[PDB]
Write an enzyme that holds these catalytic residues in place. Structure first.
Site, PDB file in Angstrom:
ATOM      1  CG  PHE A 134      -6.394 -46.193  -1.317  1.00 48.46           C
ATOM      2  CD1 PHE A 134      -6.094 -46.168   0.039  1.00 48.46           C
ATOM      3  CD2 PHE A 134      -6.194 -47.376  -2.014  1.00 48.46           C
ATOM      4  CE1 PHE A 134      -5.622 -47.305   0.681  1.00 48.46           C
ATOM      5  CE2 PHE A 134      -5.710 -48.507  -1.373  1.00 48.46           C
ATOM      6  CZ  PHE A 134      -5.425 -48.471  -0.027  1.00 48.46           C
ATOM      7  CD  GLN A 160      -8.094 -49.657 -14.695  1.00 50.67           C
ATOM      8  OE1 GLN A 160      -8.280 -48.598 -14.091  1.00 50.67           O
ATOM      9  NE2 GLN A 160      -7.457 -49.712 -15.859  1.00 50.67           N
ATOM     10  CE1 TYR A 196      -0.377 -46.910  -9.841  1.00 51.16           C
ATOM     11  CE2 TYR A 196      -0.725 -49.017 -10.921  1.00 51.16           C
ATOM     12  CZ  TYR A 196      -0.104 -48.263  -9.943  1.00 51.16           C
ATOM     13  OH  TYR A 196       0.759 -48.858  -9.071  1.00 51.16           O
ATOM     14  CE  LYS A 254      -4.977 -40.822  -5.530  1.00 50.95           C
ATOM     15  NZ  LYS A 254      -5.088 -39.814  -6.614  1.00 50.95           N
ATOM     16  CG  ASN A 266      -1.046 -43.544  -8.115  1.00 46.04           C
ATOM     17  OD1 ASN A 266      -1.721 -43.209  -9.086  1.00 46.04           O
ATOM     18  ND2 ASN A 266      -1.282 -44.656  -7.432  1.00 46.04           N
ATOM     19  CD1 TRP A 271      -8.584 -47.381  -8.890  1.00 50.07           C
ATOM     20  CD2 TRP A 271      -7.633 -49.149  -9.875  1.00 50.07           C
ATOM     21  NE1 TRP A 271      -7.744 -46.915  -9.865  1.00 50.07           N
ATOM     22  CE2 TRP A 271      -7.143 -47.974 -10.483  1.00 50.07           C
ATOM     23  CE3 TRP A 271      -7.170 -50.387 -10.337  1.00 50.07           C
ATOM     24  CZ2 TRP A 271      -6.222 -48.001 -11.527  1.00 50.07           C
ATOM     25  CZ3 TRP A 271      -6.253 -50.414 -11.363  1.00 50.07           C
ATOM     26  CH2 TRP A 271      -5.787 -49.234 -11.951  1.00 50.07           C
ATOM     27  CG  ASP A 297      -9.373 -43.291  -7.258  1.00 51.03           C
ATOM     28  OD1 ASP A 297     -10.367 -43.738  -6.652  1.00 51.03           O
ATOM     29  OD2 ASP A 297      -8.981 -43.732  -8.352  1.00 51.03           O
ATOM     30  CG  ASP A 331      -9.419 -48.485  -2.812  1.00 47.70           C
ATOM     31  OD1 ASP A 331      -8.637 -48.859  -3.700  1.00 47.70           O
ATOM     32  OD2 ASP A 331      -9.821 -47.311  -2.681  1.00 47.70           O
TER      33      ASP A 331
HETATM   34  N1  56B Z   1      -8.738 -45.988  -4.842  1.00 51.45           N
HETATM   35  C1  56B Z   1      -7.682 -46.466  -5.612  1.00 51.45           C
HETATM   36  N2  56B Z   1      -7.170 -45.623  -6.564  1.00 51.45           N
HETATM   37  C2  56B Z   1      -6.119 -46.036  -7.373  1.00 51.45           C
HETATM   38  C3  56B Z   1      -5.511 -47.301  -7.295  1.00 51.45           C
HETATM   39  C4  56B Z   1      -4.455 -47.393  -8.300  1.00 51.45           C
HETATM   40  C5  56B Z   1      -3.509 -48.540  -8.615  1.00 51.45           C
HETATM   41  N3  56B Z   1      -3.265 -49.580  -7.553  1.00 51.45           N
HETATM   42  C6  56B Z   1      -2.927 -51.022  -7.811  1.00 51.45           C
HETATM   43  C7  56B Z   1      -2.498 -51.806  -6.588  1.00 51.45           C
HETATM   44  C8  56B Z   1      -3.380 -52.704  -6.139  1.00 51.45           C
HETATM   45  C9  56B Z   1      -4.671 -52.743  -6.933  1.00 51.45           C
HETATM   46  O1  56B Z   1      -5.273 -54.053  -7.076  1.00 51.45           O
HETATM   47  C10 56B Z   1      -4.142 -51.953  -8.260  1.00 51.45           C
HETATM   48  O2  56B Z   1      -3.653 -52.819  -9.229  1.00 51.45           O
HETATM   49  C11 56B Z   1      -4.481 -46.146  -8.943  1.00 51.45           C
HETATM   50  N4  56B Z   1      -5.474 -45.303  -8.370  1.00 51.45           N
HETATM   51  C12 56B Z   1      -5.861 -43.934  -8.840  1.00 51.45           C
HETATM   52  O3  56B Z   1      -6.618 -44.160  -9.976  1.00 51.45           O
HETATM   53  C13 56B Z   1      -6.709 -43.002 -10.822  1.00 51.45           C
HETATM   54  C14 56B Z   1      -6.290 -43.359 -12.325  1.00 51.45           C
HETATM   55  O4  56B Z   1      -7.199 -44.212 -12.770  1.00 51.45           O
HETATM   56  P1  56B Z   1      -7.112 -45.017 -14.481  1.00 51.45           P
HETATM   57  O5  56B Z   1      -7.244 -43.789 -15.351  1.00 51.45           O
HETATM   58  O6  56B Z   1      -8.351 -45.876 -14.380  1.00 51.45           O
HETATM   59  O7  56B Z   1      -5.781 -45.747 -14.481  1.00 51.45           O
HETATM   60  C15 56B Z   1      -5.761 -42.005 -10.103  1.00 51.45           C
HETATM   61  O8  56B Z   1      -6.462 -41.166  -9.212  1.00 51.45           O
HETATM   62  C16 56B Z   1      -4.785 -42.960  -9.304  1.00 51.45           C
HETATM   63  O9  56B Z   1      -4.248 -42.305  -8.192  1.00 51.45           O
HETATM   64  C17 56B Z   1      -6.095 -48.162  -6.265  1.00 51.45           C
HETATM   65  O10 56B Z   1      -5.710 -49.299  -6.022  1.00 51.45           O
HETATM   66  N5  56B Z   1      -7.179 -47.685  -5.454  1.00 51.45           N
HETATM   67  N   NH4 Z   2      -9.980 -48.038 -11.921  1.00 54.28           N
END
Ligand code: 56B
Ligand code: NH4
EC number: 3.2.2.-
Length: 321
Positions: free
Chosen positions: A225, A302, A89, A195, A68, A298, A227, A294
């Site tokens: 996290f 989207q 993702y 992360k 991830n 996140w 990211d 977070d």
């Molecule tokens: N801080 C944080 N970073 C997250 C996630 C998630 C997926 N989690 C799921 C579970 C519960 C939530 O409600 C989400 O549905 C992916 N990432 C990061 O995103 C980046 C890709 O981005 P895009 O190109 O936009 O898909 C990449 O660095 C990936 O590592 C998160 O939750 N928090």
């Molecule tokens: N995101």
């Protein structure tokens, strides 16, 4: 309080940081708005995430979070699945579910330990190619052999050894799986992030609805996290501010070396951006855990307006593995 030292070590970066700072005025205002309309994180997404038995779902969560990272590039990597085109993702999540529904044994430590470059080029097949394909193969092989050698092929064994401590489980993961070791240095001090190890813990919680293997008594100890999407949302909401050279570098989509002062400041300020927002919400009687703030940010990421400042581009390094 901070048994992993994410908040402690990142706090030193935020205090000395040259290229990034928090606008505490903007934190207060976003908190006012969010607390007023009582915003919730979305529900752990059932459609694009696999589900199954206890033992297989646990290993699936480990595999999911093991790879991830880092989905940006030209041409954009995209996936067709269930008549929808996905990227980032959701491409990762779809590609894994797609492979699993066609009975690729990605939950099996024996298969992962052995998995070839071409096995995973197939799983992630679509428009362009997943960034760092070879690295994802290496990581899945590393993940299988550690599962097989140390945990009798069952991530459930790791989770049981954590005794419902999110913090204990992060530490067990980083200790056993080299590729989850997410630390850096800033002006010669170690900075700790974790992360993917922290995401993994929250994803078990989500998948198992805070029950059985997803049960944890100390989820509040998780941080954000660190990211590239969440800081993009905090810049957009006015909470993170960038000095001129970094603002221009992000605008021009110039890549930032991993572990450089600028990348480490963005990540540390992401941790404290989310923390100071969690405090301000709690102060206003909307009490969320840092991981929920977070998830919520996140999700905003989207659907950002076209022409918000682009997310920072760091090619994730595993030189030491
Ligand atoms: N801080 C944080 N970073 C997250 C996630 C998630 C997926 N989690 C799921 C579970 C519960 C939530 O409600 C989400 O549905 C992916 N990432 C990061 O995103 C980046 C890709 O981005 P895009 O190109 O936009 O898909 C990449 O660095 C990936 O590592 C998160 O939750 N928090
Ligand atoms: N995101």
């Amino acid at each position: 309080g901070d048994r992993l030292g994410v908040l402690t070590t990142t706090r030193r970066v935020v205090e000395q940081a040259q290229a990034v700072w928090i606008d505490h005025d903007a934190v207060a205002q976003i908190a006012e708005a969010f607390a007023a309309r009582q915003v919730t994180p979305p529900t752990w997404n059932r459609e694009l995430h696999w589900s199954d038995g206890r033992e297989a779902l646990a290993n699936y969560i480990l595999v999911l979070d093991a790879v991830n990272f880092c989905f940006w590039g030209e041409p954009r990597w995209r996936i067709e699945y269930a008549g929808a085109v996905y990227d980032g993702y959701w491409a990762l999540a779809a590609s894994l579910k797609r492979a699993l529904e066609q009975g690729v044994p990605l939950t099996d430590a024996s298969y992962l330990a052995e998995i070839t470059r071409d096995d995973v080029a197939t799983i992630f097949a679509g428009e362009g190619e997943i960034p760092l394909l070879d690295e994802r193969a290496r990581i899945l092989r590393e993940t299988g052999s550690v599962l097989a050698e140390r945990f009798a092929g069952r991530f459930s064994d790791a989770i049981a050894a954590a005794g419902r401590s999110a913090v204990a489980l992060v530490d067990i993961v980083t200790n056993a799986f080299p590729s989850f070791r997410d630390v850096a240095t800033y002006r010669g001090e170690q900075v700790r992030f974790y992360k993917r190890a922290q995401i993994l813990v929250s994803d078990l919680y989500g998948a198992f609805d805070g029950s059985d293997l997803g049960a944890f008594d100390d989820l509040g100890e998780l941080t954000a996290f660190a990211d590239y999407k969440v800081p993009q949302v905090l810049h957009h909401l006015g909470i993170l501010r960038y000095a001129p050279a970094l603002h221009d570098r992000l605008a021009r989509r110039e890549e930032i070396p991993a572990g450089s002062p600028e990348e480490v400041e963005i990540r540390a300020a992401t941790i404290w951006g989310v923390e100071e927002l969690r405090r301000a919400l709690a102060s206003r009687g909307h009490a969320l855990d840092a991981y929920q703030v977070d998830w919520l940010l996140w999700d905003e990421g989207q659907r950002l307006p076209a022409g918000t400042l682009p997310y920072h581009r760091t090619r994730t390094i595993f030189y030491l593995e």
